[PDB]
């Protein structure tokens, strides 16, 4: 998260920290969010061999008695996910056991009614990602408020599709999601409407988030079935 603030500890108890073990060398790291006791929603590009999810964290470098670490047992990457476009950058992860509900660990279930969110709303995203181009990931969970832009502000991105993607972050500001925030939720009026997907290597906003409303059928499908 660039230009954000430190979250009030445990104030977003659905936030998931993902370690994705690919093989013998440094892991990859993503965010995500607990939408049901044994389901975490994240980005498709955070897929890998095995994934450990840490729930209940604030400072991720210091083990806490709020932590629940759970293995992922099943990955549901969106079947139409494509690396040239990064369309359908969305994935559900079924956890080995249901998380236990605590002050620090809670779900963020969707409201019954999805709706299409237009440009102009100010939404909030949280994560442990890098705080700048040359910066390491944040030890503590950060959040930032970002403006939804007209999709024309993202026309420089390949095949950007207003129906599939949100265009997020006023270009005249430095505030933005960044590397390591992948898969984290963008909440508008407290409702998850976006998933951090990608943006410019140089961190110049806007960035691209998966538009959750488009995927509401598919998500509901997988849950009502697993």
């Amino acid at each position: 998260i660039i230009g954000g603030t430190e979250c009030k500890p445990h104030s977003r108890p659905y936030m998931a920290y993902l370690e994705i073990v690919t093989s013998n060398g440094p892991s990859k790291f993503c965010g995500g969010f607990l939408i049901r006791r044994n389901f975490v929603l994240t980005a498709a590009h955070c897929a890998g061999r095995s994934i450990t999810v840490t729930l209940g964290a604030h400072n991720i470098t210091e083990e806490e008695d709020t932590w629940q670490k759970l293995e992922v047992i099943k990955q549901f990457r969106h079947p139409k996910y494509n690396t040239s476009t990064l369309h359908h950058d969305i994935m559900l992860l079924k956890l080995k056991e249901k998380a236990s509900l605590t002050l620090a660990v809670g779900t963020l279930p969707f409201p019954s009614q999805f709706n299409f969110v237009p440009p102009g709303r100010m939404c909030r995203v949280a994560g442990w990602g890098r705080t700048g181009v040359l910066k390491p990931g944040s030890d503590t969970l950060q959040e930032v408020k970002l403006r939804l832009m007209d999709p024309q502000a993202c026309s420089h991105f390949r095949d950007f599709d207003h129906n599939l993607q949100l265009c997020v972050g006023n270009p005249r500001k430095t505030k933005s999601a960044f590397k390591g925030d992948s898969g984290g939720p963008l909440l508008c009026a407290g409702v998850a409407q976006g998933i951090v997907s990608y943006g410019r290597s140089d961190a110049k906003p806007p960035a691209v988030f998966t538009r959750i409303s488009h995927y509401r059928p598919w998500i509901n499908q997988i849950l009502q079935a697993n």
Binding site: G25, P26, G48, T83, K179, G199, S201, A203
Partner: protein, 61 residues
């Protein structure tokens, strides 16, 4: 194992930058698209690389 045939500067933060000759281990090539997820053997970083910029190490002279 794969080798960079050309230099590449990433435009998307999901992607790695690299120089001709840098070596990679491929982690995922399953999804459609011109990009494979890889890990640089130089830096240890993981990200997407253009599949056409690399070749198996034993497929170069």
């Amino acid at each position: 194992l794969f080798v960079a045939l050309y230099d590449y500067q990433a435009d998307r933060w999901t992607d790695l930058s690299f120089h001709k000759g840098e070596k990679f281990q491929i982690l995922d090539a399953s999804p459609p698209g011109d990009w494979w997820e890889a890990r640089s053997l130089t830096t240890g970083e993981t990200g997407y690389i253009p599949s056409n910029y690399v070749a198996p190490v034993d497929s170069i002279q």
